[PDB]
């Protein structure tokens, strides 16, 4: 991934938490899940037993391993579920091409 500043990290974490507050991220992670980004059980562990902020801190590790097409799929999926602003914010702060 591209270098990230602390402000960028903070924003990316905030956006991931905001997505999680509104929408099960399983729904936007379709393509990366099909491509073995993490197992179903691993994603379940990330999402169970926590606030959206704590989930975001675990989820960011997988977000930063996305390929370019996987990152785009995630952004497209946010838009397809009705979240244009979050898709735009996520695309801005993702340190990926």
Distances 82 to 5, 59, 78, 88, 93 between C-alpha atoms, Å: 29, 21, 6, 12, 19
Radius of gyration of the chain (CA): 12
The three-state secondary structure class of 69 is helix
Domain edges within the chain? 1-97
Structure solved via: X-ray
Residue 11 φ/ψ, nearest 5 degrees: -65, -45
Which residue has 């997505």 as its token pair? Answer: 19
Provide the 10 A C-beta neighbour count for residue 90: 22
Distances 64 to 30, 49, 67 between C-alpha atoms, Å: 16, 22, 9
Q: Is 36 left (phi over 0), alpha (psi -120 to 50) or beta?
A: left
* Gap between the Cα atoms of 77 and 71, Å rounded: 10
Distances 90 to 39, 40, 45, 48, 61 between C-alpha atoms, Å: 23, 23, 23, 22, 15
């Amino acid at each position: 991934h591209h270098h990230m500043t602390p402000e960028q990290r903070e924003f990316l974490l905030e956006i991931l938490a905001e997505i999680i507050a509104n929408l099960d991220p399983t729904k936007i992670l379709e393509e990366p899940l099909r491509r073995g980004l993490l197992t179903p059980a691993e994603l379940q562990e990330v999402l169970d037993l926590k606030t959206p902020e704590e989930q975001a801190k675990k989820l960011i590790d997988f977000i930063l391993k996305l390929s370019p097409a996987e990152a785009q799929a995630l952004i497209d999926a946010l838009r397809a579920h009705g979240y244009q602003a979050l898709a735009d914010k996520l695309k801005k702060y993702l340190p990926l091409e």
